[PDB]
Coordinates of C-alpha atoms and ligand atoms in Angstrom, one line a residue:
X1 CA 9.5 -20.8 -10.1
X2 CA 6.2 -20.9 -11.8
X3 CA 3.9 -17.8 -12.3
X4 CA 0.8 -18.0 -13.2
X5 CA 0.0 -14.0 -14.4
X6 CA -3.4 -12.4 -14.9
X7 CA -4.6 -9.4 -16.7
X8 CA -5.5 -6.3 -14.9
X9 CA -7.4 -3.4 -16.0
X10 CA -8.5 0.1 -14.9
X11 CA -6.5 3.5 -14.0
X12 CA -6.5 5.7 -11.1
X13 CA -8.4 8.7 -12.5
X14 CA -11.1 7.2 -14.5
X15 CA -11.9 4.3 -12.6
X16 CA -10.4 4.7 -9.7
X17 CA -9.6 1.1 -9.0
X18 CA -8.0 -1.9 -10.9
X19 CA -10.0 -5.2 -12.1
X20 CA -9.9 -8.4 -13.3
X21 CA -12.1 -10.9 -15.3
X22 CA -12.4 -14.0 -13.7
X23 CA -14.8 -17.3 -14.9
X24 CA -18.0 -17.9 -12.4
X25 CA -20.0 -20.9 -13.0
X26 CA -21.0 -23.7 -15.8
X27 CA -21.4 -22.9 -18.3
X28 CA -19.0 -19.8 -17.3
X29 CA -20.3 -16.2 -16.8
X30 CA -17.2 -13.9 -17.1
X31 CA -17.5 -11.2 -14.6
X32 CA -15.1 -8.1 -13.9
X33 CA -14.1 -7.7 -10.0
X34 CA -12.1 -4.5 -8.5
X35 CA -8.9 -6.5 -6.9
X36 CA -9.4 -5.7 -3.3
X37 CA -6.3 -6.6 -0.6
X38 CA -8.6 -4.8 2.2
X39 CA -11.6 -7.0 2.0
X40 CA -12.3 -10.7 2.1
X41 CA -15.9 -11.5 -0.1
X42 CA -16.1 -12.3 -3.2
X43 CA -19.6 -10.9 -5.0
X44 CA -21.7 -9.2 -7.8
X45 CA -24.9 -8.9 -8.6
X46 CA -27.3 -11.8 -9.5
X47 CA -30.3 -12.1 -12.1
X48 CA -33.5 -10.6 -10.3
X49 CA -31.6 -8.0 -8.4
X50 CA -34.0 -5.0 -8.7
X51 CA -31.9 -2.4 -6.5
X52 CA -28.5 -2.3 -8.6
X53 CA -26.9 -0.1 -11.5
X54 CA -25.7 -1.3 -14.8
X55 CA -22.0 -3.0 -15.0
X56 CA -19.6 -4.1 -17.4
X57 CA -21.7 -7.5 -17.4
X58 CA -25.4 -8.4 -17.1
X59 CA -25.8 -9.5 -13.2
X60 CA -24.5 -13.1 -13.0
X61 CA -27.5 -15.6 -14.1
X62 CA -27.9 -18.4 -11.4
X63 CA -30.5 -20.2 -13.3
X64 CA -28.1 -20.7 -16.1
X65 CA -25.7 -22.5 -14.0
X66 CA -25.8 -26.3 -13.7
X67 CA -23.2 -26.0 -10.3
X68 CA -24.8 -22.9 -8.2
X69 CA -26.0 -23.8 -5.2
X70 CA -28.1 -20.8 -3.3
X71 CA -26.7 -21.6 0.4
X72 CA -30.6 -21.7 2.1
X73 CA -30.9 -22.1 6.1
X74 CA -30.6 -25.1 7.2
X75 CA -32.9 -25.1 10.7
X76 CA -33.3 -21.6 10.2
X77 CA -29.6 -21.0 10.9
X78 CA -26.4 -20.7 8.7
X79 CA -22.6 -21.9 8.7
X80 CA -20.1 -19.7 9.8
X81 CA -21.9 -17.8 12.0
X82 CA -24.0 -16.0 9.2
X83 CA -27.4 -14.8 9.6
X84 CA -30.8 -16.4 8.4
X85 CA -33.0 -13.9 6.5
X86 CA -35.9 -15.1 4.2
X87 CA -34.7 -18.2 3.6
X88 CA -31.1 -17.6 3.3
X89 CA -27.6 -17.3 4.1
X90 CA -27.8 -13.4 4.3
X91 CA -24.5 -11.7 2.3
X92 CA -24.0 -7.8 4.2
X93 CA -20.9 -5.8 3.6
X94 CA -20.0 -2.9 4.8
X95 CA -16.7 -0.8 3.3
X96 CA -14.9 1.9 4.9
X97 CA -16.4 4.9 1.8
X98 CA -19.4 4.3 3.1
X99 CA -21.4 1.8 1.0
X100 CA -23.3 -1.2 2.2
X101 CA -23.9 -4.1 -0.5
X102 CA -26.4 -6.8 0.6
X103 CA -28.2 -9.8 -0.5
X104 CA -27.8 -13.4 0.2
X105 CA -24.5 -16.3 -0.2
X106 CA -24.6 -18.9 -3.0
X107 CA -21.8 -21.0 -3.9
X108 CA -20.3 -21.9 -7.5
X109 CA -17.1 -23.1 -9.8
X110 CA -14.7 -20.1 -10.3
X111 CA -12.2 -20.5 -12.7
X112 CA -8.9 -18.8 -12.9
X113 CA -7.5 -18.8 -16.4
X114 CA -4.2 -16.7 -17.1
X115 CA -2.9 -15.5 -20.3
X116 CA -0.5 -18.5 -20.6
X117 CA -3.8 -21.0 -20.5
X118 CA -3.1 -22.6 -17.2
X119 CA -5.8 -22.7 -14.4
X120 CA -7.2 -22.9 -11.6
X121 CA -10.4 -24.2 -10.4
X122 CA -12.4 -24.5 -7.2
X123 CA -16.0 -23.8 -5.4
X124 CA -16.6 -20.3 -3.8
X125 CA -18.9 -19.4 -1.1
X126 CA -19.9 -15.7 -3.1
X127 CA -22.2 -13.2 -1.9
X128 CA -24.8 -11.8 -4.8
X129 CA -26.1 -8.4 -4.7
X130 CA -29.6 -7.5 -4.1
X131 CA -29.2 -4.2 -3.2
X132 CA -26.4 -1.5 -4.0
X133 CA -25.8 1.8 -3.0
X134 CA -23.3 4.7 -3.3
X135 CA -20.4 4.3 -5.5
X136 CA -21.0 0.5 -6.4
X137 CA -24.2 1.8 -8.0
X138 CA -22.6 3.7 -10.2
X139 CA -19.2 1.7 -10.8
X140 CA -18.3 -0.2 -14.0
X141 CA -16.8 -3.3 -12.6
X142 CA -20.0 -6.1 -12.3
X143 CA -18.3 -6.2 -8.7
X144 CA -15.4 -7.4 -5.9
X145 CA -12.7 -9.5 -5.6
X146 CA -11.1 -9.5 -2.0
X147 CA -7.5 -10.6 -1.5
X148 CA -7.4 -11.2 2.1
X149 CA -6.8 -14.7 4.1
X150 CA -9.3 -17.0 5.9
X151 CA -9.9 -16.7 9.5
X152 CA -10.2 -19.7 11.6
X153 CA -13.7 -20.8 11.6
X154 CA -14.5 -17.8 8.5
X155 CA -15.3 -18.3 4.8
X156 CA -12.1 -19.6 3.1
X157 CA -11.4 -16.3 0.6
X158 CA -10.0 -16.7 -2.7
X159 CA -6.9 -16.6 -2.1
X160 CA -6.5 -19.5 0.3
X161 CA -8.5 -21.6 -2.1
X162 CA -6.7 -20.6 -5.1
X163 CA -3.4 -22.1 -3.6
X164 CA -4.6 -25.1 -2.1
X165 CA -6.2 -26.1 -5.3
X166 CA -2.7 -25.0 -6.3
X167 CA 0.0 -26.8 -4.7
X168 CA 2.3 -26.7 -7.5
X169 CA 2.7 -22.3 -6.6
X170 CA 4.1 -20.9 -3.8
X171 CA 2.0 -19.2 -1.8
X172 CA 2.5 -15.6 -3.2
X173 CA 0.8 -13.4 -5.2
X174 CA 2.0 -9.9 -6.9
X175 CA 0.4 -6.6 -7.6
X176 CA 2.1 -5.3 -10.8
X177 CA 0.4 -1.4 -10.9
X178 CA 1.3 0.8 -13.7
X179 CA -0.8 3.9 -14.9
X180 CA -3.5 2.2 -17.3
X181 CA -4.0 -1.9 -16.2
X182 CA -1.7 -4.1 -14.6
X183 CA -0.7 -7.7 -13.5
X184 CA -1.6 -9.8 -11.0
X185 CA 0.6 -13.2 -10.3
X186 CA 0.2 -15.6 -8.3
X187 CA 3.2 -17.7 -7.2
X188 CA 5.6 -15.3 -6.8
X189 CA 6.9 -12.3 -8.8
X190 CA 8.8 -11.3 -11.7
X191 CA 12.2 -10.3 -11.2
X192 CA 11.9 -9.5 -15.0
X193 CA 10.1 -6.5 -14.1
X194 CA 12.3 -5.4 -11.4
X195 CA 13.7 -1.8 -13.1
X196 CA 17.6 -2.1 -14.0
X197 CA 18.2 -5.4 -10.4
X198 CA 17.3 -3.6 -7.5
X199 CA 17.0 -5.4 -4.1
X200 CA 13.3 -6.3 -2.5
X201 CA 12.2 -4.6 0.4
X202 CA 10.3 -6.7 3.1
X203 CA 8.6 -5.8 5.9
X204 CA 6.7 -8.1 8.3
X205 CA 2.9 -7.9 8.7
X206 CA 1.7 -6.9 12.4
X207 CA -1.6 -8.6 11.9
X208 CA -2.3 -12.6 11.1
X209 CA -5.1 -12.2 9.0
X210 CA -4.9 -8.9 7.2
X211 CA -2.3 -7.2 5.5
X212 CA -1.1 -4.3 7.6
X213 CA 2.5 -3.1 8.3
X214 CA 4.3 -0.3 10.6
X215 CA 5.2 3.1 9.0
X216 CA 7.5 4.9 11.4
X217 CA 8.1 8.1 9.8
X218 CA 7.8 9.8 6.3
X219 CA 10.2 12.4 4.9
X220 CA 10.1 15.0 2.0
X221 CA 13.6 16.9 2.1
X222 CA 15.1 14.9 4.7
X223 CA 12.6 16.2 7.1
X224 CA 10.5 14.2 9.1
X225 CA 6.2 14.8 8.8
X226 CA 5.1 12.1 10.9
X227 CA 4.1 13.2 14.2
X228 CA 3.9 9.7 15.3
X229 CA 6.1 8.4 18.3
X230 CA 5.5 4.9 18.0
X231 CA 4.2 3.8 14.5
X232 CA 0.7 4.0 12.1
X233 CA 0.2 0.6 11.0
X234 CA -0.9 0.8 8.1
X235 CA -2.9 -0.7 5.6
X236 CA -1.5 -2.4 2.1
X237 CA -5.3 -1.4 0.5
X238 CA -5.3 -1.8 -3.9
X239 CA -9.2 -1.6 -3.4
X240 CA -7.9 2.1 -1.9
X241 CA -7.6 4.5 -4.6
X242 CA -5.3 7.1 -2.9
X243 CA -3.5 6.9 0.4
X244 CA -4.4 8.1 3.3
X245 CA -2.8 9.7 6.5
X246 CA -2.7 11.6 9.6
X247 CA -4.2 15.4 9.0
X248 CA -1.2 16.9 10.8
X249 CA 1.7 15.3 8.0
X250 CA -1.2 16.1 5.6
X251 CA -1.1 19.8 6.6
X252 CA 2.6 19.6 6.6
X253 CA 3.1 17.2 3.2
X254 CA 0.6 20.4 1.6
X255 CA 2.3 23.4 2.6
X256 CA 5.1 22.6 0.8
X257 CA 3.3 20.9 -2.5
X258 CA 1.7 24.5 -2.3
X259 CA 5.4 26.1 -2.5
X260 CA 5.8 23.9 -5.3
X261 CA 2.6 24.8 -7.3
X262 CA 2.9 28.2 -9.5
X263 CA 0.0 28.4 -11.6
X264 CA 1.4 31.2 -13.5
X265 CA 5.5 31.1 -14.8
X266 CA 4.9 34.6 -16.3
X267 CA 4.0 36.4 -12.6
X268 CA 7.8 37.3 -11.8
X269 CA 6.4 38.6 -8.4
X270 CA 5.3 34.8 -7.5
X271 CA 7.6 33.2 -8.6
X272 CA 10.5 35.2 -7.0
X273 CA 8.5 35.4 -4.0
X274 CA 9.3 31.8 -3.8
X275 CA 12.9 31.9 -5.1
X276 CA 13.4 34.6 -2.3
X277 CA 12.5 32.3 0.5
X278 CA 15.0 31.1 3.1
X279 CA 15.3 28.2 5.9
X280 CA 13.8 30.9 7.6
X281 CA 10.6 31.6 5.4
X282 CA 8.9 28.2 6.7
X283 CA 6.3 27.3 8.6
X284 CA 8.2 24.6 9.5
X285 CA 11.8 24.3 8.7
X286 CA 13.5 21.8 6.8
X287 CA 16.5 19.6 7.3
X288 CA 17.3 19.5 3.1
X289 CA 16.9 23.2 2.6
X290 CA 19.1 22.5 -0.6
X291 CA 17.3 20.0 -1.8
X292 CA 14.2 22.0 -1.7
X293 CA 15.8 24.8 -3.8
X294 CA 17.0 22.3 -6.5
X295 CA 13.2 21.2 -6.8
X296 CA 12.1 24.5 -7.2
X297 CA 14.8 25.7 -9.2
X298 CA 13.4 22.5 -11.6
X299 CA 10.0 23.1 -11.5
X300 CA 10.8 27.4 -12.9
X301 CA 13.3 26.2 -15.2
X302 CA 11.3 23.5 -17.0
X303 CA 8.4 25.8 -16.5
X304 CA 6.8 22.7 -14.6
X305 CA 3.5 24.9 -14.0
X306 CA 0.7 23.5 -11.2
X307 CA -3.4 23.8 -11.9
X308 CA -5.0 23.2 -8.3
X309 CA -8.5 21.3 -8.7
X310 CA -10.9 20.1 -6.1
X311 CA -9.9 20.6 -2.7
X312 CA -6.8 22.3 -3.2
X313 CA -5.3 18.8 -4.6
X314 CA -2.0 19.7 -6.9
X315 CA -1.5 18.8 -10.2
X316 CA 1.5 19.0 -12.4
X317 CA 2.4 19.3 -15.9
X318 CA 5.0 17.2 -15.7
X319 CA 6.6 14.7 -13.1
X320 CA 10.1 16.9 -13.8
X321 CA 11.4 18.3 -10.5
X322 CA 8.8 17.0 -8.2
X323 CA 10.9 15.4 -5.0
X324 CA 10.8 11.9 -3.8
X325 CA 9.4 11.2 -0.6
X326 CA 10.7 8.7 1.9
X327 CA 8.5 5.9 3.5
X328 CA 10.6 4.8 7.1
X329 CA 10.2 1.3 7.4
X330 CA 9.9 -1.0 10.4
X331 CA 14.3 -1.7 9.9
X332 CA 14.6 2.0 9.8
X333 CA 14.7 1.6 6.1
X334 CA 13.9 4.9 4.4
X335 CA 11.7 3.8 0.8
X336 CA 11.8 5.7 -1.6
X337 CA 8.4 6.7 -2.6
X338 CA 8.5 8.3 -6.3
X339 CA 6.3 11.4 -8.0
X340 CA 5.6 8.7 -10.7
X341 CA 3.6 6.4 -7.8
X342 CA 1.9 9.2 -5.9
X343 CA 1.0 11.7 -8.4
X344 CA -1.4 10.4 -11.1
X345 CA -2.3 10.7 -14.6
X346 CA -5.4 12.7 -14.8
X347 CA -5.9 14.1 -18.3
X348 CA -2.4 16.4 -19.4
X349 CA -1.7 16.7 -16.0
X350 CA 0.1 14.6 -12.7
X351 CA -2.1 15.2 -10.0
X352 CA -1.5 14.3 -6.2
X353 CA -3.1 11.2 -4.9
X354 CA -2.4 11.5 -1.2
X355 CA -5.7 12.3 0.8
X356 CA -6.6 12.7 5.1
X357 CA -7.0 9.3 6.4
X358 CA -10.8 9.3 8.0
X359 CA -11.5 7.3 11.1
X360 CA -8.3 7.0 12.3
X361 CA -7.3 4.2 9.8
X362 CA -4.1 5.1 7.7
X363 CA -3.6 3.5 4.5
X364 CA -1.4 2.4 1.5
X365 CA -3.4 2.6 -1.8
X366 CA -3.1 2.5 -5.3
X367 CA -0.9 5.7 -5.2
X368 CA 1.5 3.3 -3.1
X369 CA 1.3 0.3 -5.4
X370 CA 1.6 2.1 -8.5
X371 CA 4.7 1.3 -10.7
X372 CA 5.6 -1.1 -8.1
X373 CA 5.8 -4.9 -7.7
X374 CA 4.0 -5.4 -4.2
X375 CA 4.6 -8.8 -3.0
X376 CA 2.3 -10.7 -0.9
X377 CA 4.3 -13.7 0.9
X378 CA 1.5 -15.6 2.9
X379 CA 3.7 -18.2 3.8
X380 CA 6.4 -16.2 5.6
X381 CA 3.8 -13.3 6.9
X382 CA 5.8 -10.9 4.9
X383 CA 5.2 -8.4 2.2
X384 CA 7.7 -7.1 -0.5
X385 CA 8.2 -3.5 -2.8
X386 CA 11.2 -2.8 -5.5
X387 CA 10.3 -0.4 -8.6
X388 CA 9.0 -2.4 -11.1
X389 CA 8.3 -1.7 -14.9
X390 CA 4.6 -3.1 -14.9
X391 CA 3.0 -4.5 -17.9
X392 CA -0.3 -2.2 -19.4
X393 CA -3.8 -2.6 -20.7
X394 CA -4.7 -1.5 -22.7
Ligands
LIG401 C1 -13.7 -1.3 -3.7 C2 -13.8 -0.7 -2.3 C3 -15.2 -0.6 -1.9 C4 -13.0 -1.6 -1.3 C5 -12.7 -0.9 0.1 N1 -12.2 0.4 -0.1 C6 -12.7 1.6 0.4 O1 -13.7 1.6 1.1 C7 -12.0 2.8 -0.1 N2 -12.7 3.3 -1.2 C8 -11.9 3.8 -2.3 O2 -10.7 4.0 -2.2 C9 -12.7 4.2 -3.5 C10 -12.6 3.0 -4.4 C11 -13.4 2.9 -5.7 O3 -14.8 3.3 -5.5 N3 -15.6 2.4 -4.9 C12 -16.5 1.4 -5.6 N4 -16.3 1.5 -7.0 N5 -17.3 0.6 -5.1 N6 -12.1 5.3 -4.1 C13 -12.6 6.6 -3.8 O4 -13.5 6.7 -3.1 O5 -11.9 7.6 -4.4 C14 -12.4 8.9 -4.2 C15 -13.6 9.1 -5.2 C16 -13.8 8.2 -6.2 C17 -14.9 8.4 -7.0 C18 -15.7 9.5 -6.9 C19 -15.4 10.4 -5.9 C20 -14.4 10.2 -5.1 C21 -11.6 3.9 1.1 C22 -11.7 3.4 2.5 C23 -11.0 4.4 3.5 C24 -11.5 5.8 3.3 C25 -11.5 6.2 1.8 C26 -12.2 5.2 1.0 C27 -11.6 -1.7 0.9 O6 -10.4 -1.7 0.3 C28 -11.6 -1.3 2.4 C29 -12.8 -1.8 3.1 O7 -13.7 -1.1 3.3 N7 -12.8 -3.2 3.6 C30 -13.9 -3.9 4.3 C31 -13.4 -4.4 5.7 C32 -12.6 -3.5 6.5 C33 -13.1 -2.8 7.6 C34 -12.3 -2.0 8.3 C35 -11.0 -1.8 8.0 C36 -10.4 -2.5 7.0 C37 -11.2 -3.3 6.2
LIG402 C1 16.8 24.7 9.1 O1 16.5 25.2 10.5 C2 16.5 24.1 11.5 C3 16.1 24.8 12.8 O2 16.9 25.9 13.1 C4 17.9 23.5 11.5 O3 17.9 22.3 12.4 C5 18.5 22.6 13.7 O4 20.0 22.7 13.6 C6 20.6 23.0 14.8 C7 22.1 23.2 14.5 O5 22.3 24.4 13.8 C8 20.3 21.9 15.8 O6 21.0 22.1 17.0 C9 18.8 21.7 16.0 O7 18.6 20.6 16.9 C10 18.2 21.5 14.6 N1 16.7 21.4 14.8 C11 15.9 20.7 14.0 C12 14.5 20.7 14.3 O8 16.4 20.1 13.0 C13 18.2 22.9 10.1 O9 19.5 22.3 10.1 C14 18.2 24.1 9.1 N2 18.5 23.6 7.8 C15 19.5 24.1 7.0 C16 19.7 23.5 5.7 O10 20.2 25.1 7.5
LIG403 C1 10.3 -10.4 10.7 O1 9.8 -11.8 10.7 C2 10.8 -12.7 10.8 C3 10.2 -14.1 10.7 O2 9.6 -14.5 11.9 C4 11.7 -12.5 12.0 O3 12.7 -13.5 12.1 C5 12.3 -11.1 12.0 O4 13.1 -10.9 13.1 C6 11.2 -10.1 11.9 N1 11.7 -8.7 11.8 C7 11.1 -7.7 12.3 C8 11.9 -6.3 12.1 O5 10.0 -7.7 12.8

């Protein structure tokens, strides 16, 4: 079928998100946006913003586009069911880390171009930034691109535009993660990639409009950390740098990641302190007590040796010995969930990117995606993960 494949930028350490250059406006602006499967707007700042920090690019310039139209009130009152302030269409977002951008809905030409020179064009409904705060303040991309789909009487989002202004693509688009930049496609993926071919794993969504799915247990050594009877549905989030879960497998997940970390291979007393223990040592036991002695047994013998940095969050010299852990999927499916997708490259070191989930909303990030194709199939409600070896940028 045909793909039409994007650039993507970024890392997980650095930037802590992943971005892409897209065309705004005619003449076009080119403006960098963090690629965002957990929000719907499309925005950035715009010329005569006076509460913003500096970006990759200069705030977009509406003046200097012949096609912007600022979207004023009409009657004192706005199209889909946004709020009048001043004049205008008022633009307020809210994300889950806390920040707030804020300013007012113009729209304009965007233009998709990929590296093969074929593109997509259509208007946008965008939101320009008059006022920033917390980490978008400080942030390098200009601003944010969100992946998700219309709602019924909503703002059509990007991607529902892109493919009706695309009819000859399928409606699919692929997150291609790897540790520096990535790919994005849209009209299916690239079994190319696929490491090997291994199958594709699918998984329904359990919500029309965003993309969530139902995690039903998570293993490390065959045991079970979930605490969940029923499921955490979960959220398929590349605008999340880490994932995030329940405290309890946290707790559990980190006590033995602790076992696992020796910060000194020449204390004989600590490390045979761990050698020494038994089934019986734990906390709480495990089901693959052998497969926790060959990980350890790894991590000594290579001389794999752990630096803890802030919060108690592990890092590795090397992904050598670290074990898989084991998504279980809505078919009972157990995924396997790799050291070289949830540990991250942070200088000489491969630190864990596995955080407490905060307001009771669990998520898959970037950690997740990473060395993965993720497959978004609008059409079929679906969503898709095999290994992948994703492209890099630089
Ligand atoms: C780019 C980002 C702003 C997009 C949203 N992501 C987020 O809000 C997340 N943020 C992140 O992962 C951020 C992403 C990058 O930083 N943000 C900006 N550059 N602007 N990562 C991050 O905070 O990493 C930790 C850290 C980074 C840097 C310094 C210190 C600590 C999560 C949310 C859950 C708790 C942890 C933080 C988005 O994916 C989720 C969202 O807020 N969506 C809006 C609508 C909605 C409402 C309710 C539920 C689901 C969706
Ligand atoms: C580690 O200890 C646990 C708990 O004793 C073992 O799991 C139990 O195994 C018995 C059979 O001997 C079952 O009747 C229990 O229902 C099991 N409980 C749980 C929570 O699994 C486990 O097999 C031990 N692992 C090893 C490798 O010996
Ligand atoms: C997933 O969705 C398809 C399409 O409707 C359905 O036929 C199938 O039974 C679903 N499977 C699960 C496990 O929900």
């Amino acid at each position: 079928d045909l793909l039409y494949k994007y650039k993507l930028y970024g890392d997980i350490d650095e930037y802590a998100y992943y971005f892409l250059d897209i065309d705004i406006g005619t003449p076009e602006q080119r403006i960098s946006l963090i690629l965002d499967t957990g929000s719907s707007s499309l925005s950035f700042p715009c010329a005569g913003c006076k509460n913003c920090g500096v970006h990759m690019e200069n705030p977009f310039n509406l003046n200097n586009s012949k096609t912007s139209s600022i979207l004023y009130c009409e009657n004192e009152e706005c199209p889909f069911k946004l709020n009048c302030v001043k004049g205008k269409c008022e633009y307020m977002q809210s994300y889950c880390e806390g920040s707030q951008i804020s300013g007012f809905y113009f729209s304009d030409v965007v233009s998709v171009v990929s590296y093969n020179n074929e593109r997509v064009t259509f208007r946008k409904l965008m939101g320009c930034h008059m006022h920033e705060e917390s980490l978008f303040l400080y942030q390098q991309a200009t601003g944010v691109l969100g992946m998700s789909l219309s709602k019924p009487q909503g703002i059509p989002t990007f991607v529902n535009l892109l493919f009706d202004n695309a009819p000859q693509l399928k409606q699919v688009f692929t997150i291609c993660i790897s540790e520096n930049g990535g790919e994005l496609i849209a009209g299916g993926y690239d079994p190319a990639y696929i490491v090997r071919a291994e199958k594709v794993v699918w998984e329904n969504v359990t919500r029309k409009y965003y993309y969530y799915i139902k995690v039903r247990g998570l293993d490390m050594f065959g045991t079970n950390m979930m605490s969940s009877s029923k499921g955490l549905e979960m959220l398929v989030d590349s605008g999340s740098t880490f994932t995030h879960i329940p405290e309890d497998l946290y707790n559990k997940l980190n006590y033995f990641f602790d076992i696992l970390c020796i910060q000194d291979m020449n204390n004989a007393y600590d490390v045979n302190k761990r050698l020494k223990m038994t089934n019986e040592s734990f906390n709480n036991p495990l089901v693959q007590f052998d497969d926790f002695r060959k990980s350890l047994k790894s991590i000594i013998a290579k001389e794999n040796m752990c630096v803890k940095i802030v919060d108690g969050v592990q890092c590795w010299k090397y992904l050598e010995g670290l074990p898989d852990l084991f998504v279980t999927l809505s078919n009972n499916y157990k995924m396997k969930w790799q050291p070289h997708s949830y540990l991250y490259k942070k200088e000489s070191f491969w630190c864990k990117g596995i955080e407490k989930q905060v307001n009771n909303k669990p998520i898959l990030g970037l950690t997740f995606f990473k060395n993965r194709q993720v497959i978004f199939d609008i059409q079929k409600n679906r969503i898709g993960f095999v290994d992948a070896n994703c492209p890099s940028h630089p």
